[PDB]
């Protein structure tokens, strides 16, 4: 069972928890990073309104501009997940 | 000198070329992926108006929603670069 480590968040605690749950579901169902990212993005578009963006991977850096209170960057096990709405 | 391979683009040829030039400049100046991404994002915010987002790395998948004609995904050498405006 994969360890969640939230690295940077500008997001309600309830939503941070959902992101972690959603990513857990995604990793259960899918093995390919883009499919994992697509599942998370789509769940959040639904649960929390569009428009979300998701990057999933083991090696990347980013510079994104996000809407306040709609950004999370976390690890689920060995995989890093960036999920946010654009600012 | 690093080989540019554009993998997916919804973007004018002039802008695709600028993205490749910008990423080339970034890789000359910086070694860390987030710094490379920040340099590209900032150049495009300036040259082509906000709001851009940039991910740079060797291992990641993504699902993002972009504005039509403002998306490029390419490699510069071994590094993958995702650059886009949000749709």
């Amino acid at each position: 069972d994969r360890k969640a480590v939230i690295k940077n968040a500008d997001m309600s605690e309830e939503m941070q928890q959902d992101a972690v749950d959603c990513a857990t579901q995604a990793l259960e169902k899918y093995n390919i990073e883009k499919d994992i990212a697509a599942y998370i993005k789509k769940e959040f578009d639904k649960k929390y309104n569009p428009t979300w963006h998701c990057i999933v991977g083991r090696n990347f850096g980013s510079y994104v501009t996000h809407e306040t209170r709609h950004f999370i960057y976390f690890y689920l096990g060995q995989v890093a997940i960036l999920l946010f709405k654009s600012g | 000198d690093r080989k540019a391979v554009i993998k997916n683009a919804d973007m004018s040829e002039e802008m695709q070329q600028d993205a490749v030039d910008c990423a080339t400049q970034a890789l000359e100046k910086y070694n860390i992926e987030k710094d490379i991404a920040a340099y590209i994002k900032k150049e495009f915010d300036k040259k082509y108006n906000p709001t851009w987002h940039c991910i740079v790395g060797r291992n990641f998948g993504s699902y993002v929603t972009h504005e039509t004609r403002h998306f490029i995904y390419f490699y510069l050498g071994q590094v993958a670069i995702l650059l886009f405006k949000s749709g």
Binding site: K7, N8, D10, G57, R58, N59, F60, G61, S62, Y63, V64, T65, H66, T68, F71, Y73, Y75, Q78, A80, L82, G87 | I32, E33, K34, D35, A37, A38, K41, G57
Partner: peptide, 9 residues
């Protein structure tokens, strides 16, 4: 706001 992320690996 704009922020950076960088993977540990």
């Amino acid at each position: 706001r704009s922020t950076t992320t960088q993977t540990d690996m």
